[PDB]
């Protein structure tokens, strides 16, 4: 299948309380596989999926030193950004980093990503050409000129075309079925009378992977878009996801309603009813 790897960094300043907190998480598709927290008793990269545990001690040692260095770099970036924006040295600010690679079924790079947000606003991003930057404002143009002079885009491109693609391929070979084969939803319909005249039909999708899914209610095979309550897809906590869709219907008309489930893990789209 097509796959992605992403690293997500969050640095949060706390002036007067010490160095910023740095947290990193790594994902392959929708599976978190590593974390690092600068505030841990002994900070180090830690496994968060079983298939990464087989990586040897040199892996964990290299990555731990990288996060420690990146925490110090983000601390410098936070100091520079509050200077660029002429902000108070007393206040807490956020620097977020998001990078990684999208690959096709043959494992070739489809797209590289390397971008940043300051206090929840887009700041600077490596363009799809992996050679040029988009800066949000004159502060980000200071960073852009610094990074153009330092040939940062070249160093980012080398990672995204090399280590990112090559390590994602390795994780997929080690992850095997956990990463390659979708886990279809377990589905059921529940019925909740509101009154003698109205009832709720709720269509459940549980334990599915990956998170992408479509749930629709139909009346006589027509989508009930404007009348469906749909909850945001949510983690079960065991690496699988949940979703439900609900419709309020006239009591005794339940038989006209079908729930339609589309998920990559299903042999074919499911039609469910209250039964």
């Amino acid at each position: 299948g097509s796959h992605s790897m992403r690293y997500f960094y969050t640095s949060v300043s706390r002036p007067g309380r010490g160095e910023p907190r740095f947290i990193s998480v790594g994902y392959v598709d929708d599976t978190q596989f590593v974390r690092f927290d600068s505030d841990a008793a002994s900070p180090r990269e830690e496994p968060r999926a079983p298939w990464i545990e087989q990586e040897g001690p040199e892996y964990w040692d290299r990555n731990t030193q990288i996060y420690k260095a990146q925490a110090q770099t983000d601390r410098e970036s936070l100091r520079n950004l509050r200077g660029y924006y002429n902000q108070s040295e007393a206040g807490s600010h956020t620097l977020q980093s998001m990078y990684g690679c999208d690959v096709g079924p043959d494992g070739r790079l489809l797209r590289g990503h390397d971008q940043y947000a300051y206090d929840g606003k887009d700041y600077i991003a490596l363009n799809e050409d992996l050679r040029s930057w988009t800066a949000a404002d004159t502060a980000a143009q200071i960073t852009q000129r610094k990074w153009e002079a330092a040939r940062e885009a070249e160093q980012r491109r080398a990672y995204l075309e090399g280590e990112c693609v090559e390590w994602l391929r390795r994780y997929l070979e080690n992850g095997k079925d956990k990463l390659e084969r979708a886990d279809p939803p377990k589905t059921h319909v529940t019925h909740h009378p509101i009154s003698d005249h109205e009832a709720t039909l709720r269509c459940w999708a549980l334990g599915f992977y990956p998170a992408e899914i479509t749930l629709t209610w139909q009346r006589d095979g027509e989508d009930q878009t404007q009348d469906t309550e749909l909850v945001e897809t949510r983690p079960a906590g065991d690496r699988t996801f949940q979703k439900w869709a609900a419709v309020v219907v006239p009591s005794g008309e339940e038989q006209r309603y079908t729930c339609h489930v589309q998920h990559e893990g299903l042999p074919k789209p499911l039609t469910l009813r209250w039964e």
Binding site: Y7, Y59, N63, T73, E76, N80, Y99, W147
Partner: peptide, 9 residues
């Protein structure tokens, strides 16, 4: 595996 850090902003 993560990218080696490079220059500050």
């Amino acid at each position: 595996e993560p990218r080696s850090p490079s220059h500050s902003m």
